[PDB]
Design a protein around this ligand. Structure first.
Ligand SMILES: CC[C@@H]1C(=O)N(C)c2cnc(-n3ccnc3-c3ccccc3)nc2N1C1CCCC1
Length: 285
């Protein structure tokens, strides 16, 4: 099937399905005018009848369409026709972290340092652009053919705000709610740092440091910021995770402080990682 951009030219071929992605059904989509393939969201209007979810996508696009970084999903184009809304994004053949970790359960440090360096780099970009991702989670870290990491799904993203006028309500439902955001103080840049801690944790142990149900039963526990630190962690990793998951946010480290932590400096880290690290654990040193 051929899909023409009625505002322009401009013809596209639609290929393989890629699965469900909330409102979007995903499909491979080829721009016939340059023959590159792209991962596309296709949201029919029927599913965006209601004004606030209509607004939810406008923002994702508005915020996404200005982002150019090697570790941020490269937004290509978007257009609409009578039936559907169309968003083409960087095609990431080797899926997400979420997929990888299910296979391998738990990762070796060199790779954790390999993947985190990339999550952290992409996030300086956004954070310096004054944009908060607000949903860092293994699912939203996309890997490509050449084993490179890009952060995507900017569906719960927002611009930084004056701390007095900021959104207090939990927007959407993140994977990792923070203490501050639970005391109704709103999502800060550090609330992203929070998520990174939980994420590193998961990568090293295959289970999150706190429940991810967003149930009120689980709220005191997060607010206290108390969790099991297992002995299986070397001290560098232990220490780093701890500072990242500080209870009060203004104690959490900066992104620069993070890539410069012992965990980073006194291990070894590959420039290139094989594709077999998707399924198999690597060789020593
Ligand atoms: C299009 C939405 C999302 C995405 O944003 N990108 C950039 C992406 C980029 N590349 C792929 N991609 C390409 C080949 N396989 C995938 C894929 C499939 C499942 C999960 C993640 C990626 N998928 C992407 N996805 C998937 C999320 C869930 C279903 C579609």
């Amino acid at each position: 099937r051929i899909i023409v951009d009625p505002t322009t030219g401009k013809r596209y071929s639609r290929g393989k399905t890629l699965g469900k992605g909330g409102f979007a059904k995903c499909y491979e989509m080829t721009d016939l005018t340059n023959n590159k393939v792209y991962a596309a969201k296709i949201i029919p209007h029927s599913r965006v009848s209601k004004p606030h979810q209509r607004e939810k996508i406008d923002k994702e696009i508005e915020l996404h369409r200005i982002l150019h970084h090697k570790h941020v999903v490269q937004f290509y184009h978007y257009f609409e026709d009578k039936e559907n809304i169309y968003i083409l994004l960087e095609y990431c053949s080797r899926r997400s972290m979420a997929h990888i970790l299910k296979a391998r359960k738990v990762l070796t440090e060199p790779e954790v340092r390999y993947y985190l360096r990339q999550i952290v780099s992409g996030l300086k970009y956004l954070h310096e652009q004054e944009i908060l991702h607000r949903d860092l989670k293994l699912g939203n870290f996309f890997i490509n053919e050449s084993m490179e990491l890009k952060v995507g799904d900017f569906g719960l993203a927002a611009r930084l705000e004056p701390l007095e006028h900021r959104r207090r309500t939990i927007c959407g439902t993140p994977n990792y709610l923070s203490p501050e955001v639970l005391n109704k103080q709103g999502h800060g840049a550090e609330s992203d740092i929070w998520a990174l801690g939980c994420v590193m944790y998961t990568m090293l142990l295959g289970r999150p440091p706190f429940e991810t149900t967003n149930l009120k039963e689980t709220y005191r526990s997060i607010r206290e910021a108390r969790y099991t630190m297992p002995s299986s962690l070397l001290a560098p990793a232990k220490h780093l995770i701890a500072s990242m998951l500080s209870k009060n946010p203004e104690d959490r480290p900066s992104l620069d402080d993070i890539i410069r932590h012992d965990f980073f400096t006194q291990g070894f880290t590959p420039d290139r990682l094989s594709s077999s690290c998707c399924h198999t654990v690597p060789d020593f040193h």
